[PDB]
Amino acid sequence: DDVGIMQQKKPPTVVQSRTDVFNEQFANEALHPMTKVIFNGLDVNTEVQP
């Protein structure tokens, strides 16, 4: 129970459905635990407070 210093491991995240017409098929994907993000290229918080 403590905050890690060295970097960890990731699935990693991947983008998928966005537009107003999909027609998906559900083929493949990862049975392994993964992560899927809706918006492309987010993670915006560049301010560092010393």
């Binding site: 890690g4 060295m6 970097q7 960890q8």
Partner: peptide, 27 residues
Amino acid sequence: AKIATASSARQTDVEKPADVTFTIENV
């Protein structure tokens, strides 16, 4: 140092055929 890793080990087993000795023990 940089990335946290993982290693593996297995307890080893060492044996030779019973050697011959020329020295006696008891009377």
